[PDB]
Structures are given as structure tokens and as C-alpha cells.
Enzyme design. Structure first.
Site, PDB file in Angstrom:
ATOM      1  CG  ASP A 137      11.904  -7.392   0.283  1.00 41.83           C
ATOM      2  OD1 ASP A 137      13.031  -6.571  -0.250  1.00 41.83           O
ATOM      3  OD2 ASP A 137      11.999  -7.733   1.378  1.00 41.83           O
ATOM      4  CG  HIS A 162      17.369  -4.300  -8.652  1.00 41.20           C
ATOM      5  ND1 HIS A 162      18.478  -3.705  -8.321  1.00 41.20           N
ATOM      6  CD2 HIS A 162      16.621  -4.069  -7.647  1.00 41.20           C
ATOM      7  CE1 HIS A 162      18.587  -3.646  -7.004  1.00 41.20           C
ATOM      8  NE2 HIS A 162      17.280  -4.066  -6.571  1.00 41.20           N
ATOM      9  CG  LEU A 192      -5.187  -4.740 -12.729  1.00 40.29           C
ATOM     10  CD1 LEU A 192      -5.103  -6.036 -12.806  1.00 40.29           C
ATOM     11  CD2 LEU A 192      -4.192  -4.084 -12.956  1.00 40.29           C
TER      12      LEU A 192
HETATM   13  C1  LIG Z   1      10.507  -0.787  -2.767  1.00 39.45           C
HETATM   14  C2  LIG Z   1      10.185  -1.476  -1.579  1.00 39.45           C
HETATM   15  C3  LIG Z   1       9.699  -3.173  -1.895  1.00 39.45           C
HETATM   16  C4  LIG Z   1      10.474  -1.281  -0.251  1.00 39.45           C
HETATM   17  C5  LIG Z   1      10.570  -2.288   0.769  1.00 39.45           C
HETATM   18  O1  LIG Z   1      11.648  -3.211   0.627  1.00 39.45           O
HETATM   19  P1  LIG Z   1      12.792  -3.121   1.634  1.00 39.45           P
HETATM   20  O2  LIG Z   1      13.962  -3.935   1.271  1.00 39.45           O
HETATM   21  O3  LIG Z   1      13.540  -1.684   1.296  1.00 39.45           O
HETATM   22  O4  LIG Z   1      12.238  -3.134   3.318  1.00 39.45           O
HETATM   23  P2  LIG Z   1      13.258  -3.630   4.597  1.00 39.45           P
HETATM   24  O5  LIG Z   1      13.664  -5.091   4.458  1.00 39.45           O
HETATM   25  O6  LIG Z   1      14.502  -2.889   4.640  1.00 39.45           O
HETATM   26  O7  LIG Z   1      12.163  -3.284   5.794  1.00 39.45           O
HETATM   27  C1  LIG Z   2      11.857  -3.107  -5.226  1.00 37.58           C
HETATM   28  C2  LIG Z   2      13.045  -2.678  -4.219  1.00 37.58           C
HETATM   29  C3  LIG Z   2      13.703  -1.443  -4.778  1.00 37.58           C
HETATM   30  C4  LIG Z   2      13.410  -3.175  -3.378  1.00 37.58           C
HETATM   31  C5  LIG Z   2      12.629  -4.358  -2.909  1.00 37.58           C
HETATM   32  S1  LIG Z   2      13.692  -5.840  -3.440  1.00 37.58           S
HETATM   33  P1  LIG Z   2      15.506  -5.572  -2.558  1.00 37.58           P
HETATM   34  O1  LIG Z   2      16.319  -4.688  -3.458  1.00 37.58           O
HETATM   35  O2  LIG Z   2      15.396  -5.043  -1.365  1.00 37.58           O
HETATM   36  O3  LIG Z   2      16.299  -6.973  -2.477  1.00 37.58           O
HETATM   37  P2  LIG Z   2      16.721  -7.634  -0.963  1.00 37.58           P
HETATM   38  O4  LIG Z   2      15.612  -7.427  -0.065  1.00 37.58           O
HETATM   39  O5  LIG Z   2      18.016  -7.294  -0.616  1.00 37.58           O
HETATM   40  O6  LIG Z   2      16.983  -9.174  -1.331  1.00 37.58           O
HETATM   41 MG   LIG Z   3      14.268  -5.904   0.581  1.00 42.36          MG
END
Ligand SMILES: C=C(C)CCOP(=O)(O)OP(=O)(O)O
Ligand SMILES: CC(C)=CCSP(=O)(O)OP(=O)(O)O
Ligand SMILES: [Mg+2]
Ligand SMILES: C=C(C)CCOP(=O)(O)OP(=O)(O)O
Ligand SMILES: CC(C)=CCSP(=O)(O)OP(=O)(O)O
Ligand SMILES: [Mg+2]
Lengths: 240, 233
Positions: free
Chosen positions: B20, B37, B127
Site C-alpha cells: 500500500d 504503480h 523462494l
Molecule cells: C492491492 C492492495 C494492496 C489492496 C489494499 O490496499 P487499499 O488501498 O485498497 O486498502 P484500503 O486503504 O482502501 O483499505
Molecule cells: C497495490 C494497489 C493496487 C493498491 C495499494 S497502493 P494505492 O494505489 O492504494 O496507493 P494509496 O494508498 O492511495 O496511497
Molecule cells: Mg491504498
């Protein structure tokens, strides 16, 4: 065959948490640090719990699910198990004349018949109360809740009451013992940073709050700090 | 009728990872959101190489959840297109790569890159990297249940046979479960990741955004884990 992209928005959540889940950790350590027997500290669970419901109810919180006894602490000391199950009977004294509705989730069918009666009486006595809903997880776990929901779905499918294409998030919600609305906030006292097989399905988008405060020290001040923390948090539920 | 009273779970064998923080990383640096991304797959490959040297055997990484379909069409299309890069980054590496999730919702082109990536790496001894794409904890428990229901309707098991072991073997992420969970990006929640599998996992949350997560952040998380184990063991 699976399909999840154009599927709906189906989430049982949300300035005030409507539902708080609570893991009450730190009781044995609290006895040692002050000095009392480890019998004590376990004595403070019910009074603290009543106190927390009073404060919470005043704030607008509508549900509290409290983790008293998992499926895993059946393997704690032979003397400590027999003590705690008999002490929880004192739920009746503390809640039967309150404005608090009280339910118990878990496999009730394996407990002392004495405790089974106390639970049924406490549930029936408080069933009509209009105040805050206090759910006590006793002989409960996350694996357990999901498995019994699964057996119940399998049994319906075997008697033609549903088919595989009916099996979805709403169906599963209706079969689990802890139902929507799910916890907005989970509070774990006692310093450990995990869920330990409490809720599992239900925590999918819950905000977590961890504190080192031992549970008998967790007073009104600590609870307000937890609720302010939660209010500073930005919940996106996978979106933008 | 219920009756209650794990061949799963100092160095963690299985790490679960929630990647995230990519949009905020971009926007803070004055960059378009998509620059964030573009660091996901390269950073993940870098984390696999570091973890392999530490002795870690499995990594399960959250790349796209069943709830991310709610972002804009532009953002979703860029991401499903960008995940084809998984073939480029991993087909000729030393990592063995699997994908969990509902693949049939994806563009047929991405389904092919995934099937090719799994095919070319299936023999790697290093891994094991599990990538959760269009995955969710709700989804995984539902599909395990449908599978259990069909076995019952084909006379292969009774309701009294339904237990923790049978349920584990129907789930897409199986034993051994993650010992440690690492979530970058500052938020304290699991966001419908590996719900059943995380029952006893240690939760490690950090404010470090994913594109900044490096070797030293990873060593700090593992050191936290080893401390927790001395405390509660
Ligand atoms: C692909 C992933 C890492 C999903 C979790 O990240 P999100 O940005 O969607 O999670 P929330 O903060 O909305 O809960
Ligand atoms: C890996 C994906 C698709 C999402 C997790 S990173 P993000 O797009 O949610 O970025 P932010 O949380 O909005 O800073
Ligand atoms: Mg996020
Ligand atoms: C089995 C152990 C280590 C003691 C149980 O303590 P808790 O009931 O608070 O649950 P965990 O500490 O294991 O999370
Ligand atoms: C799980 C129950 C009944 C209480 C949690 S507090 P405890 O008795 O486990 O005490 P410590 O965590 O050992 O301090
Ligand atoms: Mg404890």
C-alpha cells in the site's frame, strides 16, 4: 466458476463507531505487577466491562463484542479454567437490571450445565432492553464461526433449500453467529499485535487499535483516546 | 452439534505483504499517480531477492483486491495492463511464481501472461512468490465452501467431516500460514486480505510507503517479529 468484478457493494461498516470489538488482555500480568494472586485481575473483567458499556452507550456506540474465552484457552491451567467459567456467572448480577441487552456467541453446548442455564437466563432477562447490545464470545473462535456456517450451508444444499450459485457474502453473513453490522474498531489491550482467532470474517475492513495498557488499567481516559484515534483515520474500502 | 476442545504456522518462514501507499508516494513527489504503480513489480522482485538470502521461503503479496474495481476505469485499465509486466520481470528469475484470485474476470491477455509465468517458473527451487490478483478473503472462503458443497452433493464427504483441515485444503492460500504480516502505507487494517490464514499472524504496520520499502525496513520488521516471539512464547 467465479465472477467478482461487476459485483455489488456489500460492506457492513460505518464520527462514532457503531460497533467496537474488544480483546481483553493483560489480567495475569496486572496481578503480578501490583502483587495480588492471579485469581485477581480476572476479578476485574465484569466490572470493567459494565463500566465500558456505560461510557460507550453514552457516546452513541450501539454494539460491543468482547472476547472472553477462545477455543484455545481451554488448554490453560487446570485450576484457571474452572475458576473463570464459574466467575462469568456473575454476569447476571451486573447486567440483568441494566439497559443492556446481552447475547453469548460460541458453542454453548459444551459448557457446564450450570453455566448454560445462567447464560440462557441472562439472555432472556435482558432480551427486551433497548440500550447497547453486548455480545460475549465464550468458547468462540474465528475458525469455529466459519465452519458451523459451512455445515449449515452444506446441510441446506443437501436438502434442496439452496444451490451453489446462491452461496455469496450475504448468505454467509446470515449464517455466522457474529452478523452485520461488523466492527468499525477493534481494541486490543495487553501489547500483543494480532487477532488470535477472534473474529476473522468480520474484521475485513475494521480499524485496529493496539495499546500496552493492561485491561484492568483500561479506563474511560484510555477508551476516549482509542475513539479519537479512530476518528482521525481515513477509510477507503478499496476505493478512492 | 459442535465440539471444540494446525500443521501450519526466529526467522519467519512465510511473510504476507500488503503493498500500500503508491498513489501518495507519487503525489508527494509531484509525479502522476501512474509513476507510483510502475514501482510495484520491480520493488516486489527486489524484496524477493533480499528475502531469499535471509532464508524466507514463501511471500504472499496483495497486488489487486476484489474491491479495487471501484477505482476509475482509467486506473483499473492501466493496472491490469501493467500487471502483464509480471512475465518480463519473473519468467527468467530464480523465483517460483503462483497467482491466487479469480483469473476469469481478467483480460484474456493477462490470463495468458499469468499462465505463462506460472509455467516457465514452476521448476524453480528458490523462494515461492504468491501474487494475489483480483483476490479477497471473502472470495477465498466462499469458493472453498462451494467446493465443499459440491463434494457433499457427490457423496464424497458428510457434514460431520467438515473441519479445519478439510477447509484449509480447499482454500487458495494453504498451510503453512503467514508468520508475519507487513503492511506499508500507514493504515492499520487488513482490507479483506488473507482472512482465515491470518488467525495467528503477527501484524506489523509501518508508515513507509511501498516504493520506499527497502532492505533496512525489512530487517527492522523481522527484528520486531523476533522480539514479539520472546515476549509471547
Ligand atoms: C492491492 C492492495 C494492496 C489492496 C489494499 O490496499 P487499499 O488501498 O485498497 O486498502 P484500503 O486503504 O482502501 O483499505
Ligand atoms: C497495490 C494497489 C493496487 C493498491 C495499494 S497502493 P494505492 O494505489 O492504494 O496507493 P494509496 O494508498 O492511495 O496511497
Ligand atoms: Mg491504498
Ligand atoms: C497461549 C498463550 C501464549 C497464552 C494465551 O493468552 P491470550 O488468551 O491473551 O491469547 P494470545 O496471547 O496467545 O494471543
Ligand atoms: C483471554 C483472557 C480470559 C484474558 C486475557 S488476559 P490473561 O489472563 O491471558 O493475562 P496475561 O496476558 O498473561 O497478562
Ligand atoms: Mg493474554
Amino acid at each position: 466458476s467465479c465472477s467478482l468484478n461487476l459485483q455489488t457493494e456489500k460492506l457492513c461498516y460505518e464520527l462514532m463507531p457503531k460497533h467496537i470489538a474488544l480483546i481483553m488482555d493483560g489480567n495475569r500480568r496486572w496481578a503480578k505487577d501490583k502483587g495480588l494472586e492471579v485469581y485477581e485481575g480476572h476479578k476485574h473483567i465484569i466490572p470493567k466491562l459494565k463500566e465500558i458499556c456505560d461510557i460507550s452507550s453514552k457516546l452513541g456506540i450501539q454494539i460491543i463484542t468482547a472476547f472472553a474465552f477462545s477455543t484455545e484457552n481451554w488448554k490453560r491451567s487446570k485450576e484457571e479454567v474452572d475458576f473463570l467459567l464459574q466467575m462469568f456467572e456473575e454476569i447476571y448480577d451486573e447486567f440483568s437490571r441494566s439497559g443492556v441487552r446481552v447475547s453469548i456467541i460460541g458453542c454453548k453446548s459444551d459448557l457446564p450445565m450450570t453455566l448454560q442455564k445462567c447464560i440462557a437466563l441472562t439472555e432472556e432477562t435482558t432480551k427486551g432492553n433497548k440500550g447497547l447490545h453486548l455480545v460475549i464470545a465464550l468458547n468462540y473462535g474465528g475458525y469455529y464461526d466459519i465452519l458451523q456456517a459451512t455445515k449449515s450451508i452444506v446441510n441446506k444444499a443437501m436438502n434442496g433449500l439452496l444451490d451453489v450459485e446462491d452461496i455469496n457474502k450475504n448468505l454467509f453473513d446470515q449464517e455466522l453467529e457474529s452478523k452485520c453490522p461488523n466492527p468499525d474498531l477493534l481494541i486490543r489491550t495487553g501489547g500483543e499485535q494480532r487477532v488470535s482467532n477472534f473474529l476473522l470474517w468480520q474484521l475485513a475492513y475494521t480499524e485496529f487499535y493496539f495499546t500496552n495498557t493492561l485491561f484492568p488499567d483500561f479506563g474511560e481516559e484510555d477508551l476516549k483516546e482509542a475513539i479519537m484515534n479512530f476518528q482521525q483515520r481515513h477509510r477507503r474500502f478499496g476505493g478512492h
